[PDB]
Amino acid sequence: AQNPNCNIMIFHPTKEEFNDFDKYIAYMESQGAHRAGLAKIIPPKEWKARETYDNISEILIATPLQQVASGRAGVFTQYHKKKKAMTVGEYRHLANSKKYQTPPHQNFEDLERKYWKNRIYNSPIYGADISGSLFDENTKQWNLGHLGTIQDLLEKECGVVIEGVNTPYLYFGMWKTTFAWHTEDMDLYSINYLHLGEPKTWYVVPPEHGQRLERLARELFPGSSRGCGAFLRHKVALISPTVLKENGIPFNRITQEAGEFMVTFPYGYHAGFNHGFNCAEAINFATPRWIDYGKMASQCSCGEARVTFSMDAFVRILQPERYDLWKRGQD
Numbered sequence: 531a532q533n534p535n536c537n538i539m540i541f542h543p544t545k546e547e548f549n550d551f552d553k554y555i556a557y558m559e560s561q562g563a564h565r566a567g568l569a570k571i572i573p574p575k576e577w578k579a580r581e582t583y584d585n586i587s588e589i590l591i592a593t594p595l596q597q598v599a600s601g602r603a604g605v606f607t608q609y610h611k612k613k614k615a616m617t618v619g620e621y622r623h624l625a626n627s628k629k630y631q632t633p634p635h636q637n638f639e640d641l642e643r644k645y646w647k648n649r650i651y652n653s654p655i656y657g658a659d660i661s662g663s664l665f666d667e668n669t670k671q672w673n674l675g676h677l678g679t680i681q682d683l684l685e686k687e688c689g690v691v692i693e694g695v696n697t698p699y700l701y702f703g704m705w706k707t708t709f710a711w712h713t714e715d716m717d718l719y720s721i722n723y724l725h726l727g728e729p730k731t732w733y734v735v736p737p738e739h740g741q742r743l744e745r746l747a748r749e750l751f752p753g754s755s756r757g758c759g760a761f762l763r764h765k766v767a768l769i770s771p772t773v774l775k776e777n778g779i780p781f782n783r784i785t786q787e788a789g790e791f792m793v794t795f796p797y798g799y800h801a802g803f804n805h806g807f808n809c810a811e812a813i814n815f816a817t818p819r820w821i822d823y824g825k826m827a828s829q830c831s832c833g834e835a836r837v838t839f840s841m842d843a844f845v846r847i848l849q850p851e852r853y854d855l856w857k858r859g860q861d
């Protein structure tokens with residue numbers, strides 16, 4: 531079995547290997563990359579996402595989210611307070627202000643220490659989940675607005691034609707902005723490209739050990755667990771690496787820098803934080819190997835998780851027994 535310790539793997543495809551996205555994903559899995567839950571892909575040196583980022587400041591963040599924490603430094607939840615709209619230029623200036631800017635630090639490890647020590651005492655503002663793309667239309671390789679759609683993959687594998695669309699989302703981050711522990715909707719893959727700015731640190735639990743994380747989370751967040759049998763779908767809980775180590779949960783960590791792709795694999799729980807002002811683009815995708823994960827994915831039916839239009843069909847076709855209860859949650 532390849533990669534039996536579930537280490538995060540890093541790949542350096544040549545320009546030739548970068549042509550066929552599906553083929554490269556299947557290659558990475560042949561080497562065991564999925565066992566980690568997360569992989570890094572460094573694009574060939576000849577590739578570029580677009581020519582420059584000099585003209586992005588007029589993009590609108592219609593609903594910036596202030597991420598307010600509650601709990602203790604290593605075990606906390608966050609709620610998202612909606613703020614007034616602002617442009618990317620306005621947000622960048624805010625991220626760079628004294629109140630929100632990255633502190634002086636020695637290296638990524640010192641910054642990681644400071645994040646876990648001090649995150650809860652601040653409420654950074656995240657421009658998340660903004661439909662759109664920063665890939666040039668002429669970029670033909672690994673262009674996250676030109677991937678094959680998940681609806682087309684389900685149709686190719688299973689023969690059933692379904693409604694829905696699959697588009698990318700932009701993320702504008704600042705120091706301490708945080709992504710809570712989660713897997714993707716319907717335990718899909720995700721791909722994330724860091725277009726510009728400061729790094730993003732990731733934590734990940736191997737898919738084969740995801741239930742260990744869930745059992746810890748039920749212990750650490752006991753009221754939330756009673757409220758919903760899939761409350762990590764709410765995407766609000768954080769647990770530090772120190773706490774994960776104390777409780778014997780297998781995980782790995784890696785820092786993504788500008789110009790790099792990360793892939794998350796089906797049922798790979800992940801969480802992380804931004805080092806400073808940055809912009810990422812991400813989208814969900816599927817392969818044949820996902821189908822079985824989609825059929826088994828947990829679901830939130832309490833009403834909190836509220837998701838896209840396109841998840842309806844996935845539930846309806848892959849999880850018909852759960853469909854009625856899940857749909858009630860959506861309405």
Ligand SMILES: O=C(O)CNC(=O)C(=O)O
Pocket residue numbers: 701708709720721722794800810812813
């Ligand atoms: O970058 C972020 O804030 C969150 N991204 C992801 O969870 C992802 O790409 O799957």
Ligand SMILES: [Mg+2]
Pocket residue numbers: 585586587588589
């Ligand atoms: Mg602009």
Ligand code: NI
Pocket residue numbers: 712713714720794800
């Ligand atoms: Ni994710």
Ligand SMILES: [Zn+2]
Pocket residue numbers: 757758759760761763764830831832833834835
């Ligand atoms: Zn729920």
